[PDB]
Amino acid sequence: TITYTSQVANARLGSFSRLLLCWRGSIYKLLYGEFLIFLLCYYIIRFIYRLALTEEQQLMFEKLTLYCDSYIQLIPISFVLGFYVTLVVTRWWNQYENLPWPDRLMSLVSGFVEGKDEQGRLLRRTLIRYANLGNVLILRSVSTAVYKRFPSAQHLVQAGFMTPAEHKQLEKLSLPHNMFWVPWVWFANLSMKAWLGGRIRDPILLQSLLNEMNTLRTQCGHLYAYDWISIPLVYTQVVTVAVYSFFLTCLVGRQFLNPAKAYPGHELDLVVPVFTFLQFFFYVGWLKVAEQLINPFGEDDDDFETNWIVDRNLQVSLLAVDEMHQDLPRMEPDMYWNKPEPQPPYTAASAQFRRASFMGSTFNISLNKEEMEFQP
Amino acid sequence: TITYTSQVANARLGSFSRLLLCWRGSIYKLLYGEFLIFLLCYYIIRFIYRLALTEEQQLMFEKLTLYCDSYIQLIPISFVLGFYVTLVVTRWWNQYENLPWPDRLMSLVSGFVEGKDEQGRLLRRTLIRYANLGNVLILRSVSTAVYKRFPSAQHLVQAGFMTPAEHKQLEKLSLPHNMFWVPWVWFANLSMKAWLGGRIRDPILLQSLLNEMNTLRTQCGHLYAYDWISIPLVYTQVVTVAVYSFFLTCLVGRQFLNPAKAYPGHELDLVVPVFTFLQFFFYVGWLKVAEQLINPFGEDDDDFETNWIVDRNLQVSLLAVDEMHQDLPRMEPDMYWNKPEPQPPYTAASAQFRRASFMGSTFNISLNKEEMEFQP
Amino acid sequence: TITYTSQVANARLGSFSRLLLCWRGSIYKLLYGEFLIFLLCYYIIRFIYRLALTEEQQLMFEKLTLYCDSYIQLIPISFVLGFYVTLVVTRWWNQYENLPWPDRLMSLVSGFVEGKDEQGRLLRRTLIRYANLGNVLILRSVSTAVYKRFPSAQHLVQAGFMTPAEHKQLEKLSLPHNMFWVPWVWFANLSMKAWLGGRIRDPILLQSLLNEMNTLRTQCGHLYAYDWISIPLVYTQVVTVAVYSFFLTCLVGRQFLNPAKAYPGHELDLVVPVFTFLQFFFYVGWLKVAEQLINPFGEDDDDFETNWIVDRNLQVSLLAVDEMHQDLPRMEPDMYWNKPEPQPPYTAASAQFRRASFMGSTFNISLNKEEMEFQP
Amino acid sequence: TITYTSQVANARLGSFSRLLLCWRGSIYKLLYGEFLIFLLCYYIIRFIYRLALTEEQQLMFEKLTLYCDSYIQLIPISFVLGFYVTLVVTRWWNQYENLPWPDRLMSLVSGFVEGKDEQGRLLRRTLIRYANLGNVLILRSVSTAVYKRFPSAQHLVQAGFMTPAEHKQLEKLSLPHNMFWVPWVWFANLSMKAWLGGRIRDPILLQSLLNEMNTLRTQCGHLYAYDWISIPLVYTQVVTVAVYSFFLTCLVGRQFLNPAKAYPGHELDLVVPVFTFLQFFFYVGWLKVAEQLINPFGEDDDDFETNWIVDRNLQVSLLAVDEMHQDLPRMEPDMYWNKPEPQPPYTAASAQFRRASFMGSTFNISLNKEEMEFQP
Amino acid sequence: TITYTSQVANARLGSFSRLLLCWRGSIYKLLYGEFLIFLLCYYIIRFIYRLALTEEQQLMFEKLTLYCDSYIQLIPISFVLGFYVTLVVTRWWNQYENLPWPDRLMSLVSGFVEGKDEQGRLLRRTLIRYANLGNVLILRSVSTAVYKRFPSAQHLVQAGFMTPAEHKQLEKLSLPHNMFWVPWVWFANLSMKAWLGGRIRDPILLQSLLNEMNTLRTQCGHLYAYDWISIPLVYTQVVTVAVYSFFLTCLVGRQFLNPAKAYPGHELDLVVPVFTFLQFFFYVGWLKVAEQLINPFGEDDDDFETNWIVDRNLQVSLLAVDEMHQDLPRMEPDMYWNKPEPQPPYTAASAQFRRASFMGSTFNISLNKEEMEFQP
Ligand SMILES: [Ca+2]
Ligand SMILES: [Ca+2]
Ligand SMILES: [Ca+2]
Ligand SMILES: [Ca+2]
Ligand SMILES: [Ca+2]
């Protein structure tokens, strides 16, 4: 993830222009290789046409160049890129939305599972650990970074996500499919035992806990679905053919023909097809948007920071259910205890953001005494 | 936020034309700087071409101008702007939808947490204060205006959003990540204590309270997500390249060539490229839509009024849970107590809006006696 | 609202052609003023060019006309209109979806709040009245028609939406923001008192009531949001500039030049630029779609019938919770009491709509005896 | 509804080509009338131009034809059709999604409402009958086919959807608005009586029943909304003007001019403007998509089969709550009772669909011994 | 399903270029037949024009070719394909989202339905078997692969999805509609009996079980809806006409005319219309996206693996509710038991993915001492 939110807070003079000076996650970094190949092919064709070809061969090449330049179209490529890239971007955001966060669940485990004794601590930590374990099992299935960190279940044991007993239980349960679903079943059974054992005081609280846990299960299922059900290969191939064909055609149609022939549109021979290069940056960059986002769990600069998410989730969840269980700041009368209309102050830097309330769009409508009179 | 809802209530003669006379949040305010730079560059090129260049240099420049004007295309730029700006606008509205409002929660805290004594008052105020504190922690993380108002946690203490005890508790819990999640865990634990202490009469009410609070947590998580996971930089760079390249090409391709040469389309030499300037306003304004909305928590005219939202939420939430707790208007027979079909009157100004009921699209279908007879 | 659903039930010969004979909510009614202005400007330019201008001035004007006609483009305008109008239409439907209906809530108030005595009647009527009052407070904030009907809270008292005691309570609670949220807090507190007083038999029923009421609160909050957070002014100005600039350019570029000059495309001098007028109807009508829908709570023909909704909601809600409370039709064996497979008859007019069940797309697949045999 | 799902299961050679041989719900059936009118007008213009017009009149007509053919544009029409038709298709699917199915509710009524005696049977049947009655009241309000089947409430009585007592109760409750909402209030009151009478054992079950019933109410409200709030007439008129104007222009611009004049593009005089006819099929068919779908409750081939849905819902709901109440198949050990990893067999025809599990996209990543070592 | 997620994890040099070397689910496999037919027709026309036609016939053909090449347009086809294919892709993903997974339900059945005795085992297995049976009944109705595996209910009995007693019960209940809904009613009745029999301890747990089961019912209803309510045939025919007409026109308009005539754009006679073939691959591949996805339950390479889903669901669900019922790994202090801030290690391969926390976009804003001072 490359965050530039702070740089685009305001629509300042050349706000997006300044973003062209970025390297990480940039268009430049994504297509410089393809652009260099295109550059080399274009100038190989230029040298061949200018030097190797005979006069008749040069005339045939100049006819082919006019034909190819005539057969370059930007509407179909722009359209298919628009729709395809929009699909990729939509799926990208949906995949972020299906990253499981334990925060809702950990609030409920901290609140509902009772006991400051070692047994209550162990129960709360085990429940939230099952949640984190389910999350990491799916993430190591879909994220290259997470997999490289946990290339085997034994790595999960060494890293403390899974106990040796949990590892042994998983091996006993082995089916020939991804076992990421197991910790949810464990969570449901352990929550039930907690309720039957009196650690959860009422089955409505158990219902809430299982509802939050199942929300996480649905998110994990969606991550599995996106990882398994790729955008149909035929669609990806169609967009790829459109782009690569446009520029293969440009390799001949955008050659600078010999000025001596004075062909329409070839009066001057600049060596650099600057406009063609700008079209390359635009169209191939547009395609690189999809190439980066199609699998957002890879190692691209703008792929999701899955390892950070795993670490943060573990730290926060264990703190929430263990140290923060019935550990509250003292409850005392607040600063506005007997102030009907509290008005927190503004800083010198923030004074300009104090606003009057918007009362509704009708607030300023003017009506005469007669207009406002009720009729029988 | 620039509200013009009242000005566009009706589709009146030149309804949108009148909006062109607005300055705050206007296209003019957003691109006048870029337009002045473009204006200066265009006329520098004009003066250089007209005065400095020799006859041969002028002919070469006139060839380059014809080439550049030939290589100006509006379909790719319009397409990429359409899709990109639509993405930005969608994310903009989603970010508004993830601004947390305490209204649902405060109704439940006012209703369910019992006691007119000082302890009940303190409990209700503390719960709703935890909600407001969570909200402000995330908002100061994502909103420049809120941050400038609360540039440190100590500012939150001075402003009355957090007690000194709450501040000390937060410092004790410090992890190397944003601690905006803490007040939710506090809320869950305090609600649990209220239930165990008899201030909440039934665990179903506790379940409802925690459900509303967790809804707010999800909204805050979404604000964090949008602040962290920018639109991929490559996409922003692609759109920026498209626009800036179009107009860099225009800087040469839209020059008024010497009329004496009588080039096709250069018969008359107007000094102002009015059409090019209109295209600038259109395309760069379209891009400025995204530039303003990409981070709606900045200080642009049309960015969200986060400080007002924080102040209003605090005032309303404290009033709802403290002064309005079991404080109801007298319950008395309404004006339509024994009126089967109440017909509230209309004013002279509103009489034209009295309507007959729409009974359904089938209501006026005509059928003969034979057509309506049931068959065996 | 102009309903034409019945007229377009079937795809009949010239189904949409017949809709061009409509006046109310029509394109004609929305742009005739702008079209007349455009008509007058076009013919003023025609008369000036034909009569006032000298021969040299006429030649300069004919050059400018060719230039302007060359610089007319329909792709950018069509694109920006497509995206902008789609945004407006989406927001329009979302605003309809956020109009609160009390039907779900009134079913629960009728069912759950017990007692045929005067106290039960008063309690049910007061609860549903709080719902209707919240609805009308927001609607009078966002709807010009509702505001003109209720230009002050005292009008709400005279119309029977609010009691004098409720009015006094509201004035006591006054904060410098829209108080539309107050009746929800009152509802929560009154429902709690009903439960504690035994009128609501179980807290799960209280939970359901408050859930439905909070759904209405969220809808009202969305109405407030749409009324406050306009589509960014810059976007509206961009689309407006695109359209108005297209047609300002047409005012010169679409002039009929003197036939004697035999300019390419000006061989014949028709006086009416019929195609330009059709383009005006199309593009300015497309923009008028947005101009009407951008604020659907105004007084346009196709704005929502908010006053009718308020009246109907009041009548239905009071009937549902008061007259229909435990007032059921006699429960008796239905016509199909001992008929395993009930087959309600068809009329002569409806006989053609009797269908066989669709059993699924696989139902007709043919397989040989060998194909259907299970393998080991 | 024309179902062709089975015909397009696979992407076979000319899969969509074979669909052009369909008549019911076809493009041919929808526009043959308009196409015949267009055909007649085109050839009337041809005959007039070829025979009636004088030489000078023919030259004027040939100039007008060149002008009109120059002023034919396909981008605006394609754009506006794309956006408008997409809106219609979206609303079409949303309307299908708002067709109420009693299946969830009928499972809960079958399970929760106890008693195999006549009273329990009557209670279950009455509750599910109220659901079906609400559904049919709205459907007869919005569906021409349903209305023609039930053109009066008395028809609902004769068809067995409503008892005479229910009819009398409805007439007593009459307000000047659609009464489709009444059966929900009856359902809520009858469910409450069932709970108070001990037929529903616990208020949580009552809560579930009312939640499912209210889901159906929301769906019915959406059907009402779509029936009432048409797509704004101005938008429909805009698209209609675009299409009809394109083809009115084609009526002159696509005439075959006299070959003797050798106009550019009129060298050969084919009598049939085949390309213009293909454009007619395309554009007018695209518009006919909207014309059919704009009201999907009419009698078009591809309108919804509302009568079938009503009949099926009645049959299934009554069977589910009456015959299937506590009528279960014997519970016995399944075929895989002591089989840890059940492997149901495949047929000869299905053997090729047996697959290995997809274990996740990371499953095949290769790492060296050093790469997989944890670091301190 | 063709999964290529692992191949597109990163935006590597020619990432999408490498996907053009795929056969299964490829563009090549989907249109080679149509392309061969197009190839044969094009060269038959070439041979006829070059050999059979006389000089006058050749001149007429050359005029028709110029006319046809003039009448080839790519904007309407690209537009209609964009919108239509987007609709198909949206419906495709929605259909995947409506594939029922028993995981949420099986967690609740494993947790809530008590007893390690044979009766508890039978009850849990029967409940989850009803869920799987409902799923398979709908899937065999909509999926050709599933149907070919289970071409009759007796096949479901032989495969162990349904007992002989369940089969007999289904035959007794037979109505003239798809009976896929029956197992939900059985589930509701059996869950109710379990609660009344004490196997489910509290009606809130029963409520949760039925809520999850009804979610599955809604998904199955959606699968039925998509299978029944095809995309309107007229829309499919419109897109098909656009594509097939474009290429039928190309069959004449893209012929290589005799070079001796030196027609504009026919200077050189290449035999292969390479650009036309690329346009074929692009446009017909784009259409093949829809042709494959329109029914994603067929046997295409990229259709869903329904049989695998059925097998996996059965195996996992039975394991979860039977072997894993109250079978938990030992609960023991985790590796971070007394570690406030757990820091799981990284591998050598994963060290580069360790990140600092993103604290929010405001974290780096700089303010002076005066700017941060609160004002009165
Ligand atoms: Ca990636
Ligand atoms: Ca901003
Ligand atoms: Ca309006
Ligand atoms: Ca229809
Ligand atoms: Ca398929």
Residue numbers in the entry:
A (entry chain C), B (entry chain B), C (entry chain A), D (entry chain E), E (entry chain D): 2 to 377
The authors write:
Bestrophin-1 (Best1) and bestrophin-2 (Best2) are two members of the bestrophin family of calcium (Ca2+)-activated chloride (Cl−) channels with critical involvement in ocular physiology and direct pathological relevance. The bestrophins are a family of Ca2+-activated anion channels consisting of four members (Best1–4) in mammals. Ample electrophysiological evidence indicates that the neck and aperture serve as dual Ca2+-dependent channel “gates”, as disrupting either of them partially impairs Ca2+-dependence while disrupting both makes the channel completely Ca2+-independent.
To elucidate the architecture of human bestrophins, we purified WT hBest1 and hBest2 for single-particle cryo-EM analysis in the absence of Ca2+ (EGTA), or after a 30 s spike of 1 μM or 5 mM Ca2+. Under both 1 μM and 5 mM Ca2+ conditions, most of the hBest1/hBest2 particles (~90–95%) were in a Ca2+-bound closed state, which is very similar to the Ca2+-unbound closed state. On the other hand, the hBest1 aperture exhibits several distinctive features compared to cBest1. Secondly, the Q208-N212 pair in hBest1 is connected by a water network in a similar manner to the salt bridge between the K208-E212 pair in h/bBest2, such that Q208 points directly into the central axis of hBest1 (radius 1.8 Å), whereas its counterpart in cBest1 points away from the central axis. This structural divergence is rooted from their different primary sequences: in cBest1, the side chain of Q208 fits in a pocket enabled by G209, whereas a serine at this position in hBest1 (S209) makes a hydrogen bond with Q208, causing the amino group of the Q208 side chain to point directly in towards the central axis. Consistent results were obtained from structural analysis of hBest1 Ca2+-bound datasets, except that residues 346–355 (yellow) and 368–378 (red) were relatively less disordered compared to their counterparts in hBest2, suggesting a stronger binding of this region to the channel periphery in hBest1. Notably, a direct contact between F354 and E300 in hBest1 is disrupted in hBest2 due to an insertion of F at position 353, which also offsets the residue numbers of hBest1 and hBest2 by one within this region.
